[PDB]
Design a protein around this ligand. Structure first.
Ligand SMILES: CCCCCCCCCCCC[N+](C)(C)[O-]
Length: 124
């Protein structure tokens, strides 16, 4: 009969990424038993796509923030903060609903998101 809370460390890790750009990405997980979103993994300032992808379980949903930077032709570095709702096909329908129904509430704690994505792997 309890709602979905968000552990303080979630915003703190996000704040470091947004303010200091010290983390390439952050992977969040919902602990249903404790009914709270927690930090599962925090990446170094520079991480490959493979290292990030490795952090998204093929059998479970997650939320993630990815600081997607790119270099312009003028050799200028820019970045967009991506919010990602990872929803693999084999995850339990129940878990998918839990992540989906708590998505907006969690996002609300992460001011500064510029692009929102929902991702799945069709190579299940
Ligand atoms: C910043 C780029 C946004 C792309 C996010 C897409 C992440 C997909 C990761 C697939 C995970 C692969 N898997 C299931 C084997 O773990």
């Amino acid at each position: 009969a309890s709602g979905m809370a968000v552990h303080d460390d979630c915003k703190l890790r996000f704040l470091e990424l947004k303010a200091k750009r010290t983390h390439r990405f952050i992977v969040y997980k919902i602990e249903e038993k404790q009914k709270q979103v927690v930090v599962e993994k925090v990446g170094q300032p520079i991480q490959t796509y493979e290292e990030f992808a490795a952090c998204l379980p093929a059998d479970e949903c997650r939320y993630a923030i990815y600081d997607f930077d790119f270099v312009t032709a003028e050799n200028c570095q820019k970045s967009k903060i991506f919010f990602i709702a990872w929803c693999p096909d084999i995850a339990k329908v129940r878990s998918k609903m839990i992540y989906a129904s708590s998505k907006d509430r969690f996002k609300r704690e992460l001011d500064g998101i510029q692009v929102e994505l929902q991702a799945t792997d069709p190579t299940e």
